[PDB]
Amino acid sequence: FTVTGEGLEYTWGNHPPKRVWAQESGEGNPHGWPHEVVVYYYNRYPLTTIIGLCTCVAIIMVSCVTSVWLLCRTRNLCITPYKLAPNAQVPILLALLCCIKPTRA
């Protein structure tokens, strides 16, 4: 019988009913490596840690592609007024720091 924190009462034959409650022992360890914190909350909350892990891997995935959509849009605007004219002198700050493509010619 699955006993949760609310409790469970069972009767057997002509014996009086007995109530038992479940504690929060678990198996995992919360203060440790990332392969142990996930295990500990998988036993204590099996219904929530598979949604929150899927939510946090979806917020990160959406935020990763939106940022590189804006970063590469910044990147080709560094080059498009400078690679159209090869005689224009590229400053040494814009070669590596502000945008990736280094100077030439």
Partner: protein, 441 residues
């Protein structure tokens, strides 16, 4: 002094509070519930039991014919058989051959056991809720008397005056119609005293166990006596009440939620746990001492020795204090993080004392007040070794009770870094836009 608060609807867990009258020392207050009975109002509709079909003596005419009259009896039956030629002891009973008549009437009446076991049909309505409360305050011992759970009627216990507030929910385990057979209660529907399908539950309904009028359908039907034997046979369907005692499910005292044990004599529903109960109490003015006649503590330092997750009293901590004089003053933690086992401490001049507490958090961040002076407490707790215990939890589990310090750090890392990685992306497009405007002119 009037002190109003809200207590939960838990039986075994006491409610501890600290009243604060200005100019006076605080007084400890402990309220505990001992019962919780919900008593609905019932009116009995009818009873039912097993029948008993009695047969009177039939008349035997030697050669003739009679027809019976319709008698005011439940399920009365008549059927006249012609030409029986019956035999008894000492030769044939009658002389006129091939033309005889047997009456053979029958009807249905109640049985002798209907005064012992019978199912009673009830309709319930919302009634009164009554509870018993254990009360102590200050140096006065525990005093107990029953109360009424409604926000109007007061109860005088000891020298105080308590008004228990109305329940926050109107949940009741009873259906609109119930059947009370013997010891246990069932949720069932009635055929409403005018119908009955002769074999299920309402084949014999009487409004009162001592009533005169009775309704019964049992498909009673007489048969023809054979071979010249003076007897009246009949066939009918068996008892529905006898059939009901086999094919009945689980009673209401084994099905009902929230652990409501069901008693019978007023048909209450004892010891449910749903909602919360507001309180209002009147502590007498003789239980308040002046503020100048009490110790005033200072230099409080709290260190938690051992803490654990277990449900019952899991935590020991030490508090170092410095008091002006020796005396007694209570302790209380007003937050919901931890509850306190003790109620008061005996003080000295610059000593120490210990208290016991129970909590559900990994890192307790609660504070306690002793001698109208507060002190915070922090520490770490371990999971308990035991798996199943036979007592309810003293504490309340919150939403952030299970989140540790390491798990909080991964939340801030996985939110702050991804938010700044868009903010840097958003501020990157605000740099070349200003640069492009400078390049235009």
């Amino acid at each position: 002094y009037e002190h109003t608060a809200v207590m939960p609807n838990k039986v075994g867990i006491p409610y501890k509070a600290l009243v604060e009258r200005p100019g006076y020392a605080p007084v400890h207050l402990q309220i505990q519930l001992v019962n919780t009975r919900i008593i609905p109002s019932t009116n009995l509709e009818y009873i039912t039991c097993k029948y008993k079909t009695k047969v009177p003596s039939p008349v035997v005419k030697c050669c003739g014919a009679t027809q019976c009259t319709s008698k005011p009896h439940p399920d009365y039956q008549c059927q006249v058989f012609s030409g029986v030629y019956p035999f008894m002891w000492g030769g044939a009973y009658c002389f006129c051959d091939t033309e005889n008549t047997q009456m053979s009437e029958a009807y249905v009446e109640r049985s002798e056991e209907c005064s012992i076991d019978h199912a009673k049909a009830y309709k319930v309505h919302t009634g009164t809720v009554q509870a018993m409360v254990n009360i102590t305050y200050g140096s006065v011992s525990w005093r107990s008397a029953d109360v009424y759970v409604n926000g109007e009627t007061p109860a005088k216990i000891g020298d105080a005056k308590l008004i228990i507030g109305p329940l926050s929910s109107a949940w009741s385990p009873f259906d609109n119609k119930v059947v009370v057979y013997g010891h246990e209660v069932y949720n069932y529907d009635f055929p409403e005293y005018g119908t009955g399908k002769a074999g299920s539950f309402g084949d014999l309904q009487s409004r009162t166990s001592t009533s005169n009028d009775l309704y019964a359908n049992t498909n009673l039907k007489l048969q023809r006596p054979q071979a010249g034997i003076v007897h009246t046979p009949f066939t009918q369907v068996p008892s529905g009440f006898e059939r009901w005692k086999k094919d009945k499910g689980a009673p209401l005292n084994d099905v009902a939620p929230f652990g409501c044990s069901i008693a019978l004599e007023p048909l209450r529903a004892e010891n449910c746990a749903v909602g919360s109960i507001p309180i209002s109490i009147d502590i007498p003015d003789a239980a308040f001492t002046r503020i100048s006649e009490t110790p005033t503590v200072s230099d409080l330092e709290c260190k938690i020795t051992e803490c654990t997750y277990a449900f019952d009293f899991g935590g020991i901590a030490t508090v170092a204090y410095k008091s002006s004089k020796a005396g007694n003053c209570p302790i209380h933690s007003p937050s919901g993080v931890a509850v306190i086992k003790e109620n008061d401490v005996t003080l000295a001049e610059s000593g120490s004392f210990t208290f016991h507490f129970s909590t559900a958090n990994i890192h307790p961040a609660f504070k306690l007040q002793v001698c109208t002076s507060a002190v915070t407490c922090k520490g770490d707790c371990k999971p308990p070794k035991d798996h199943i215990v036979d007592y309810p939890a003293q504490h309340t589990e919150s939403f952030t009770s299970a989140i540790s310090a390491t798990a909080w750090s991964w939340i801030k890392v996985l939110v702050g870094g991804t938010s700044a990685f868009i903010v840097l992306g958003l501020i990157a497009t605000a740099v070349v836009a200003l640069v492009l405007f400078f390049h235009r002119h």
